[PDB]
A paper describes a structure:
The [name] gene from [name] encodes a protein of unknown function with a molecular weight of 14 502 Da (residues 1–126) and a calculated isoelectric point of 4.9. The final model of [name] consists of a protein dimer (residues 2–126 for chain A and residues 3–79 and 82–126 for chain B), six ethylene glycols and 224 water molecules in the asymmetric unit. In the ‘closed’ structure ([name]), the helices partially unfold and rearrange, occluding the cavity and decreasing the solvent-exposed hydrophobic surface. In contrast, in [name], α-helices α2 and α3 are substantially shortened (from four and five to one and 2–3 helical turns, respectively) and α3 is rotated by ∼90° from its orientation in YP_001095227.1. In addition, α3 shifts by ∼5 Å towards α2 and thus eliminates the cavity. Residues from α2 (Trp71, Leu74 and Leu78) and α3 [Trp98, Val102 (Ile in [name]), Trp105 and Phe106], which are exposed to solvent in YP_001095227.1, relocate into the protein interior. For example, in the ‘closed’ state, Trp71 is buried from the solvent and participates in multiple van der Waals interactions with surrounding aromatic and aliphatic residues (Leu8, Leu29, Tyr34, Leu74 and Trp65), while His6 and His31 face the solvent and are not involved in any stabilizing hydrogen bonds. Arg14 of one subunit hydrogen bonds to Asp33 of the other subunit, which is likely to provide some stability and specificity to the dimer formation ([name]). The lack of conservation of this serine in [name] indicates a possible loss of functional similarity to [name].
The crystal structures of the proteins encoded by the [name] and YP_001095227.1 genes from [name] and S. loihica, respectively, have been determined at 1.8 and 2.25 Å resolution, respectively. These proteins are members of a novel family of bacterial proteins that adopt the α/β [name]-like fold found in STAS and CRAL-TRIO domains.
Author numbering:
A (entry chain A): 2 to 126
B (entry chain B): 3 to 79, 82 to 126
């Protein structure tokens, strides 16, 4: 009834360093892809930092439909830059998107976490 | 490891899409220069003809008054029906100020999330 579904993209500064943030939540549909991804793309294309990394909060993501457009989503940076690091935060138990959601990104390194503090420390230092 | 910044999104509750924006920490002029182009890039892609905005300012401490944040105007390509601002502080500190970034039929301040969201989808 009140369950939320979708994603948000942002920029956060932590200890003087800016990073891109992404939060995915609920169960994503085809309609959701059509409505939400142009906005994510529009946002990410305006990020122009010397080096930049990404924090992906997927703790509240259920997943998406079999072979949905979400499998092939690509989120890239303003001048074809790659993310230095991408920290993917999940939960204790494996979820259907675990081995798939990383492919949205071109990254120097992708690391998976169950604790936000650890994820942020790895990104920052 | 205190976070300072803003995120923008689209969420759906049942069958209704709404724009969502969360602001956190104390925003500086450098933050403005880095975040506002992305915020504007996101908003220019919202095509839904009837749409509202949920603004989560629960973790917002404020911004530098000499920074461009005071003057920010966010909009659609073309207006929000409703903007629901969620926060804990006396409204006169920042709620009216951040509310003024938007043009909308109605702009309302809430301390309860459930009530804010219900009001947006009515």
């Amino acid at each position: 009834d009140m369950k939320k579904h979708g994603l948000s993209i942002g920029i956060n500064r932590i200890e003087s360093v800016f990073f891109v943030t992404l939060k995915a939540i609920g169960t994503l549909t085809h309609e959701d892809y059509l409505v939400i991804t142009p906005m994510l793309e529009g946002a990410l294309s305006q990020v122009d930092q010397p080096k930049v990394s990404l924090f992906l909060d997927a703790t509240e993501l259920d997943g998406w439909d079999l072979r949905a457009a979400w499998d092939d989503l690509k989120l890239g940076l303003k001048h074809k830059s790659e993310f230095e690091r991408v920290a993917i935060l999940g939960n204790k138990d494996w979820q259907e998107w675990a081995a798939k959601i990383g492919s949205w990104f071109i990254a120097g390194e992708i690391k998976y976490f169950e604790d936000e503090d650890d994820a942020l420390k790895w990104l920052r230092y």
